[PDB]
Amino acid sequence: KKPRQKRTATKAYNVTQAFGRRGPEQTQGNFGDQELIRQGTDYKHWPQIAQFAPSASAFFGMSRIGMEVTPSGTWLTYTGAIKLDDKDPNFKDQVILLNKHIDAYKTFP
């Protein structure tokens, strides 16, 4: 039922079904290995990924936001960067986990 931005992926409604196939196009998402894509927020290390996701206030606070109002459709666009905390004892594990999921689709069979 829900607008795309408010969906929560799970094993019953997975990342592909919720957000489309992972791929190279500007309008496709590129994040997730095979296990994350199948499990969504059921994934065993989801809480470690979700720690980087913005609050509603931070999404509107930190990002560069645009509006593309066209004859074909309107899109709110967003871009930004979130600094990892070097001095967090889990930093090395975070780097590893993010490395596993970013562009992982490139290697799928």
Place this chain on the structure above:
Amino acid sequence: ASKKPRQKRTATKAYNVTQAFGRRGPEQTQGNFGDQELIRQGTDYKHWPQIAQFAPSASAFFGMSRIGMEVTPSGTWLTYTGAIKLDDKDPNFKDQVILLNKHIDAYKTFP
């Protein structure tokens, strides 16, 4: 409120958008969203719910976005880009668009 990682911060009247997220401005990775009133008020802005409806859930942030990782002299950064489609068949559509435009780059019109 200020204890939290930046991306989990919640701006309010007591801890405002400038305080939590820095001054609005034109540079990449500097925020550009908010007029004087939203800036002061954060999530106490009367019309915050009509804005927040466009913010993504954590699953959708990682599901919809293009994500990168960049290692620079300033540290390690998780970068992101994406776009959320408005429902142009919703009777509230033009209201929504007016509300978003009112805040996008508002900072250009004041010191």
